[PDB]
Symmetry: C3
Subunit: 264 residues, 3 copies
Amino acid sequence: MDTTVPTFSLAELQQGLHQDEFRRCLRDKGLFYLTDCGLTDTELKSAKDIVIDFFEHGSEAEKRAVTSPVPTMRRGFTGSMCYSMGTADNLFPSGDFERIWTQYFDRQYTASRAVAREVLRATGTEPDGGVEAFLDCEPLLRFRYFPLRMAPHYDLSMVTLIQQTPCFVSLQAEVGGAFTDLPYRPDAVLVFCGAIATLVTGGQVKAPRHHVAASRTSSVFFLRPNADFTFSVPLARECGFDVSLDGETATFQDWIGGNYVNIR
Amino acid sequence: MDTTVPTFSLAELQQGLHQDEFRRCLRDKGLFYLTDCGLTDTELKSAKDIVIDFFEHGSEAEKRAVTSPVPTMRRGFTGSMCYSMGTADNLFPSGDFERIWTQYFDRQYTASRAVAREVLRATGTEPDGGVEAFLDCEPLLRFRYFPLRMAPHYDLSMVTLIQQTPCFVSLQAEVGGAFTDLPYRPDAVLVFCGAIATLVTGGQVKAPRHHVAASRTSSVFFLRPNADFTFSVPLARECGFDVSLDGETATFQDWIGGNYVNIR
Amino acid sequence: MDTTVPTFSLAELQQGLHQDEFRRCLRDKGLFYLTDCGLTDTELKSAKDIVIDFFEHGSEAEKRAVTSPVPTMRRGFTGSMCYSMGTADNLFPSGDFERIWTQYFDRQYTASRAVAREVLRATGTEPDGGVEAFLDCEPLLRFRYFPLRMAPHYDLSMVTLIQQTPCFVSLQAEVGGAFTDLPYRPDAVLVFCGAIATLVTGGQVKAPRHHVAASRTSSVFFLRPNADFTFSVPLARECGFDVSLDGETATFQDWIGGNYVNIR
Ligand SMILES: O=C(O)CCC(=O)C(=O)O
Ligand SMILES: O=C(O)CCC(=O)C(=O)O
Ligand SMILES: O=C(O)CCC(=O)C(=O)O
Ligand SMILES: [Fe+2]
Ligand SMILES: [Fe+2]
Ligand SMILES: [Fe+2]
């Protein structure tokens, strides 16, 4: 096996091309760069700049108004600074910021659902309840500015898309038993498959561990299922999930609990 | 905004005074000193002395008899030594200790419920099931002797009351984006608002992060809701809670799980 | 009390001998060596050698085929290397490996159930649903090669059996308020009582904290209850469990969640 992190064109995957290669990548590596997905440096610029500006020039009063009463980093500002958002209940410092970041979020959300749809297609997977219900989920977008820097872990998402700005290559993932560099690619977004991909496809997809080594920024978009996403308990045990679930079927909520857990 | 940790007289809050100031403090800071609440250095002395004595002169056999089979630090002795207790199922080394600490616990419990009642009043909050059912809960008292010393975090309680004995100021909380000193006050108790206050009031109360920096002792009283405390799922998502709960309403148990989690 | 880690012969415990001593050990220490249980250095050799061989000579392709898509360390290979297995859904590199490790697992499983049966007998405990249903559970076997090395914690199992290969004594447990050495014993297996023993017997059994200090190998076998193991909520609170469970009875799943948690 070649320990290279492959790259796939989204348009090409949708054309039905490179299926075997794609399947093999999902199974043995669980990560790849994605091109032609509506996400490039061009998008990352407007959002990065305006939020970076906010981090450096926003008054203490402005940041307060966009900070949640509970420091969960789910929405708004968080003091490595962070800015998070989802499909709703967002906190935006200004109209300009809102317009830019709402557009940026939608683009990120569309590419994530699209690539995930391909992950389901390539593995011939039909989630309980159907593909669409599964993909119209609970994504979370976290933009972080970093002026190890993050312990090893795998993501519990379906897929996680990451856009970075270069410094030194900080992001690293395990490939072929070794931590491999995952540098910026102004033309592509980095896709990490998470535990839910592994679970929903019956173990056809690997969820690789990764970490941040020790300025940079990272835009991390988690495509997370709904609390009611349902799956087979026996099948989960067949691919490595050490579940303590009574019964034949269970929901994401039964497994993870009442609060989203993004990494592990 | 003034980054000063304000002080409120409980008797005064009950008189209906300083309401706007109080509301503003809860919202922007989530912490304050509380005076006139039946808790002073005078109470802290008897309990501190007798437990300190126990920590320094209790035989290994005496400490065993007051140590739980599972080291959960929920009740009894724990080897920074600790002594914990609740409304029942307590472990007391002697009759004198019991009389002193039972009285100390009741005083702490009464002040916590009282201040919490005011927090609910100021925010015009009526918990599902009523105020009284909500306040007659599952508090936990932990006394620790310390011969960072405790990582940053916020409390998942409704409110947490802390009485300390000075050394250097170890306790610190984030106020205005900066960790501020929270020194002893023989005349007052320090009140931290926890995540449940934020949740029950619909985001009207902030749960500030805090930590212990690097001898001292601290008496920490967590006022925690019952497993059945119920709340609106949509409203929880509106103020920052990244919940994975199916449905419109949920209980504390659905959210946190089957074991109390005090900090996060 | 003598802070010595006692040793019990399984055959002797089954004969009904040393009952008071046994009861006292469970209550005040929660740990002991177990002899005459079908587990000696002789068994540990075949399994150790063949797996050690695999760790040092298995190709990257061979290790991949025995590695789970999700890095949960529940089954198969994990890069301190580890090899895990349970009653089913196992990943074996070869027929020889399978035959050796299946036999090794069954031996470990039989001794664990046997000693646990004695723990239940000595404390006059009858688990809800009966002894047999309780013991036919969800064990997990983890073999680790180590070329503090492991933070302090107690196990959430019923009992945990450990077989080691000496180096320096790395394994240590708290006995009498002090961390005591727990060296290899080619003739005996080390038994740690876990939280479930404490819970099911109503607090008659202690779950001691332990840790690994800073090459060696350890074969750790967790005897874990089923998701549906049921217990009394009031009784759990009586012996130290800080539960947030509504109702009179609860299952292991209600308490721990949808994913097995082995230590705490
Ligand atoms: O900052 C990065 O590049 C990675 C972040 C990451 O893995 C996460 O947030 O899970
Ligand atoms: O020791 C202190 O002063 C604070 C303790 C604390 O924050 C806690 O126990 O959550
Ligand atoms: O490696 C050892 O000897 C102990 C391991 C242990 O306590 C565990 O896996 O819980
Ligand atoms: Fe990640
Ligand atoms: Fe705290
Ligand atoms: Fe352990």
